[PDB]
Amino acid sequence: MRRPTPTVYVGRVPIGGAHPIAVQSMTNTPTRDVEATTAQVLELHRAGSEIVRLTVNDEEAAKAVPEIKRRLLAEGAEVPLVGDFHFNGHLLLRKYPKMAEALDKFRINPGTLGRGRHKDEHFAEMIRIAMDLGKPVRIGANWGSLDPALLTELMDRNARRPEPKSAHEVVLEALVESAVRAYEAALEMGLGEDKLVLSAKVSKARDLVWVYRELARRTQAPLHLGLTEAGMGVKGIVASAAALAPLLLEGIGDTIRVSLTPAPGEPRTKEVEVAQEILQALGLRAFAPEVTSCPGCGRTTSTFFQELAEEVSRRLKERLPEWRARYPGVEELKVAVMGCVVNGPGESKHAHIGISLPGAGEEPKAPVYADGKLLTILKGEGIAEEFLRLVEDYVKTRFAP
Template identity: 30%
Template sequence: MTSITVKAGNVAIGGGNPIVVQTMCNTHTSDVEATLGQCRRLYGAGAEMIRLTVPGPGDIAPLKEIHRRLREEGIDTPLVADIHFSSETAIEAAKVVEKVRINPGNFHRDHQKACEQFSRLVAVCKEHGTAIRIGLNHGSLGERITSLYGNTPIAMKEAAMEWIRMCITNSFYNVVVSLKASNTIVMVEAYRLLAKAMEESGTIFPLHVGVTEAGNGDSGRIKSIAGISTLLSEGIGDTVRVSLTEPPENELPVARYLADRYGRRLHSSMVSINIEGRKAVAAYDAPSRDRLLMDFSADFGKMLLDRKIDEVELKGAYTGEDGQRHLLDGSDYAAYLVDELMQASRRRFYRPEYVACPGCGRTMYNLEETFNEVKRRTAHLKGMVIAVMGCIVNGPGEMADADWGYVGEGNHRVTIYKGKTPVARHIPETEAIDLLLALIEKG
C-alpha cells in the first residue's frame, strides 16, 4: 500500500501529515488590490492554503502579480487556482501557482480528448512542481458518468477513480481528490466509497474534504462539521475547507477546530453521555456558545448520519460572552441545536433546506445579503430545498437537488429555476426575490 504525500509549495498534504486548513477568496482575481488584501487577512487568520478563482486566460496576469507580491511580502501560503471550463487556463495557471483545482465534469465530453487535455496539463505540472486537485462535485458530474451510474455517490467514486487512473498512467502523483456534495449523506457515502476503492487499488491519494454550498450562520457550520467530522473521525481527509456564504475569514476557526480535534490537539467539552435504546443524552461543560455548537455537531453528527441513534438531548451548560454560565437542560438553545443537527444529518426537517455557494470571483451580486433575505422570506417553507447561487456558469449544475434556485447571471440579472428548469430569465435583481416567492406560491 502506498500513501501519497502531495507537495504544494511549502505545504505537505496526506501521508500522515497534519490536516491542512484552507479557504478561498471571494474577490475578483482581476481586482489585484482587493484580492491581495483578502489574502493577507486570510494568511493572518491562519489559512494554510488559499484558493483564487481563475475564470479565463485574462485572469492569468493578475494571478501572477498577486503571487509575486505576496511572495515579496514574505507571505508564502500556497495559492491554488480554481479552474472550471478551460484546460488552457489550467495549463497557464499551473505555471504560476502551487496547485490547480480542476473540475473533471468540465473537461471534454469525449473521454479520449479529455485524456489528451489532462496529459498536457500534467506535463506542465511536472515541469513546474505544481499539484492538482481533482475536484468533483455531486452537481456537476459529466453526462457519460451519470448515464452509467446515475447521479449517485457510486458515480462520484467511479469518476474519481477514472481520473486517478489517468494520473497513474501519466506517472503523476502530486494529486489531491475531492468529492463534495451539499447533501451530507451523499458526501459521506462518496468519500467512504472512494477511500475503500483507493485502498483496494493499493495507492492512496490525499483527500480534500468539505460539504459544498453549506450556507451560512449556525446551520452552515453545523452541516459542515457533521459531514466533515464523520469522515475525519474515520481517518478520511487530509485537508479541509469549510464553505460558508460569509467572508472567508469566518471559515477558518471552524476548519481549524476540525483539524485540531482530529489531529488530537483538542477534546470535546462533553462531560457525560448516556445512550438508552436509540436516544443519547449528553451533558456538556462548554467554554463558549460556539464551542458547544462545534463539539455537539462533531460528537453526534456521525451517530445521526449513520442512524446509530434517532434522538439526542443536550444537558449541562456553556459559558456565554457575558461570562455567565447558561444552563442547557430544557433550554431553547439546546432544542435549536438539536433541530439544526437533525436537519444537517437529514434525519428531520424543521425548516427549509438551503443550498448556497460561498461565492467567489464569479459572483457579481451581493450574495450574502440576498441569501439572508431569501432565508428570511422563505423560513416558513419547511422541507423545501432552496438554492441561492453566485453565478450562472456553475450555479445551476452545483445546486444539485434544489426545488427552487435563485442564480445570479451577472449584470444585475437573475435566473430563477424550478428544479433543473429555468422558469424566468434576465429578471432584475430588485424584482427577483419577489418573483421567486410568487412562483413558489403558484407551485
C-alpha cells in the same frame, strides 16, 4: 486511526497521513483585481488558512496570478496558491506559463473538461503541464458538475443489476467513479503519487460520508474533504461539522475546506474559523485556547455567569498573539467557567484551570481549580479580573519554554 497516504507538498505545506490536517479556503474577490485578491489571500492566511485557492477563470485572471504571487512574496508570505480551473484550464495553462509556474497547485474538475472526446485531450494537457512544472494537482469532482456520459454508463450498469439501486445511489457511484478513473489516468500518464490529491464533494452530509469512505477504500491518495454548498449561517456551520466529523474521526481526510455562504458584509474568514473549530473539537489539531462552560440553568444567576464566560473568552482571544509567541503549546489550553456546584468543580478539574461560581443555595464564593486540584477561592467584586490574572499566571508556568 489516521489513514496512511503519501505526502503531497502544496508549496511548503505537506498534506497526507503523516501530517496535520491542513485548513484551506478560497477567495471570493475577482482574481483580476490584484489589490483586492492579494489582501484577501493575506487576510485568510492570517486567520489560519494554510493553503489558499483562487479561481482562474479567464485570461484576465490568469495574467493577474503572477503579480498576486509576487506581492505575497514581497511581504514574506509563503502561502501556497491553488488555481481553480473550469472549462478552459487547458487553454489558460498553455497560454500563460507564468501563471502556471506561479501557482503551487492546479485543481482539475473531471466534469468541467469539455464534451466527449475533448475531455481526455484537455485532461492530458493539464496533467502534462503539471508534470513539466513539478506541480501537484487536485482532481476534484463535485456533484454539481458530474460527467453526464459517466452517469449514463453507470445508470445502464445499474439497470442490469438483479436489484437496481436508486437513481440517487447511482449518482453517488458515478461521482466516486469520476474521481477514481481520473486518478488512475493521471497515475498512468506518469504524475507521481506525491503530486495527486482527490476530492468528490456533495452537499448532503450522509452522502458525503458514503462517498469519502469509497474514495478512501479505492485510492491511496490524500483526500481533500468538504461539504460543498453548505449554505448560510447556522445551517452551514452545523451541516459542515456534521458531515466532516464522522469521516475525520475514522481517520479519513488530509485537508479540509468549509464551503459557507457569507452573509452580506460577513468576513470570508468565517469559513477558516469554522474549519479550525471542527478540527479542534475532535482533538485533531489545537489552534487556540478554548473555554468549556455550562449552559446555565435556574441554579445560576443567568447574566453574571454568561457575562463572565464571555469576558474570559474575549480575554483569551486578546492574549493569544502574544501567548503564541512566548508560550509554546498554549494552543492546548482548556479553561472552564461553570455556573454551580453540580458540575462546576468536576468540570473545572478536567480543564487546565477552571472557576466554579456559586449557584442557588451556596455560599457566595467561587472555587478555582488548576491541574485537577483547588488553587484558590475567590469572592466579592472583581472575581473576573482575579480569575484572568490566575489564568495568566497559570499559562506563564505551564507553557514556559
